[PDB]
Design a protein around this ligand. Structure first.
Ligand code: M4J
Ligand code: FMN
Ligand code: ORO
Length: 365
């Protein structure tokens, strides 16, 4: 463990958390990240951590989850922090304010957060112009193994969810290495309930037709991001549609609307999605199920409660090719990224894996 890891985890982040409400702390974290005001990434990525998936090289398998950089303001700072890939968004077609404040709550005793932001978004046109300003810088980053994902949402008052996603594909698809469609924010009325199988097939058919219409250099992979709260029937139906349509991958999982027994935080009964440690094993088990139902042929990005190398390797062994985190960064600060990478490399060696690739889905064998 480094000097920075202990200083951020034991002293700086708890002190800042004592001074700032979580939304103010997030806004300051995005601004500092955007300005490069972040500790030196002392972890040189080894060859063991390189992954080839979704038509791209990934220098390391640890990404920043959607929601940290909703509006594409801090992408370059996030690579500087040591992430192997960045996902921005969710981005909605039109700008929207999201829910009234307060709308995010820390559960420090649980190493958890509850959020109900409600897709606050600068909208597609603002994010398009932001990504255009650094499009060729991003082309070089992607070529050097640091890809960019864009997570697409829908407006609260949309009368045609599939058309909102199609607009996102047309506008930001040409600027993305991969696109994500949520069947899964807990904080918009109707999004998770297009699990109705024929309706999911109709939505994803439209999204894939729009993606296929882009020029080859500008044609991203398309992934579906799912909730951890799906029925067995919902998971069977998603696996079926994903294989039928040739969806490129899955992101498993979003936040949970469940409240696991044992939460201690005073704010545990706030409305919203729960993230961090209490989500971890529900997310790992969802990865394991989706990997089996897709016969290991559909790349999975594993997300929920990753804050250590062990957490990352458990999701990789369950079937994830890549992992993401958000809530750990909230609690432990920037040093957590190097921590996860160092711990994951050590555990791969301890368990006899030549690299990340050899560990993907190892538990199923
Ligand atoms: N050339 C190196 C350099 O300028 N380093 C630097 C390191 C820390 C800070 N910094 N200074 C403060 C304070 F309190 F003194 F003003 C706070 C931090 C800090 C604290 C937490 C985060 C970040 C940056 C991002 C971030 C993202 C996710 C969560 C927490 C934070 C920066 C500023 C600069
Ligand atoms: C404050 C907050 C905002 C989020 N916003 C989004 C979003 O806009 N789109 C999305 O797909 N996921 C969003 N997520 C979910 C994360 O991408 C991730 O799936 C989830 O938080 C689990 O990872 P974690 O336990 O490492 O935070 C958000 C999560 C948090 C905590
Ligand atoms: O904007 C939000 O409220 C949000 C979106 C999402 O997909 N997940 C989440 O936990 N919150």
């Amino acid at each position: 463990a480094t000097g920075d890891e202990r200083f951020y985890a034991e002293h700086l982040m708890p002190t800042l958390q004592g001074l700032l409400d979580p939304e103010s702390a997030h806004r300051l974290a995005v601004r500092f990240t955007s300005l490069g005001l972040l500790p030196r990434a002392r972890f040189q990525d080894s060859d063991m951590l390189e992954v080839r998936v979704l038509g791209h090289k990934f220098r390391n398998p640890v990404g920043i989850a959607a929601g940290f950089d909703k509006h594409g303001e801090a992408v370059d700072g996030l690579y500087k922090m040591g992430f192997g890939f960045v996902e921005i968004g969710s981005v909605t077609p039109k700008p929207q304010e999201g829910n009234p404040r307060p709308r995010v709550f820390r559960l420090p005793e649980d190493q958890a957060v509850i959020n109900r932001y409600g897709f606050n978004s600068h909208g597609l046109s603002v994010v398009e112009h932001r990504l255009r300003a650094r499009q060729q810088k991003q082309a070089k980053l992607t070529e050097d193994g640091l890809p960019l994902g864009v997570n697409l949402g829908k407006n609260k008052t949309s009368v045609d969810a599939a058309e909102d996603y199609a607009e996102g594909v047309r506008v930001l698809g040409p600027l993305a290495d991969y696109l994500v469609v949520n069947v899964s924010s807990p904080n918009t009325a109707g999004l998770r309930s297009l699990q109705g199988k024929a309706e999911l097939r109709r939505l994803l058919t439209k999204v894939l037709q729009e993606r296929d219409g882009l020029r080859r250099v500008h044609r991203p992979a398309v992934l579906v991001k799912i909730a951890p709260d799906l029925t067995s029937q919902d998971k069977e139906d998603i696996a079926s549609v994903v294989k039928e349509l040739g969806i490129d991958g899955l992101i498993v999982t979003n936040t949970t609307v469940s409240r696991p027994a044992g939460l201690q935080g005073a704010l545990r009964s706030e409305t919203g999605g729960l993230s961090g440690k209490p989500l971890r094993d529900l997310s790992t088990q969802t990865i394991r199920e989706m990997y089996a139902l897709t016969q290991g042929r559909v790349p999975i990005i594993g997300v929920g409660g990753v804050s250590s190398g062990q957490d990352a390797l458990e999701k990789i062994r369950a079937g994830a090719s890549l992992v993401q985190l958000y809530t750990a960064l909230t609690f432990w600060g920037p040093p957590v990224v190097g921590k996860v990478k160092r711990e994951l490399e050590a555990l791969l060696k301890e368990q006899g894996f030549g690299g990340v690739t050899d560990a993907i889905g190892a538990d199923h064998r």
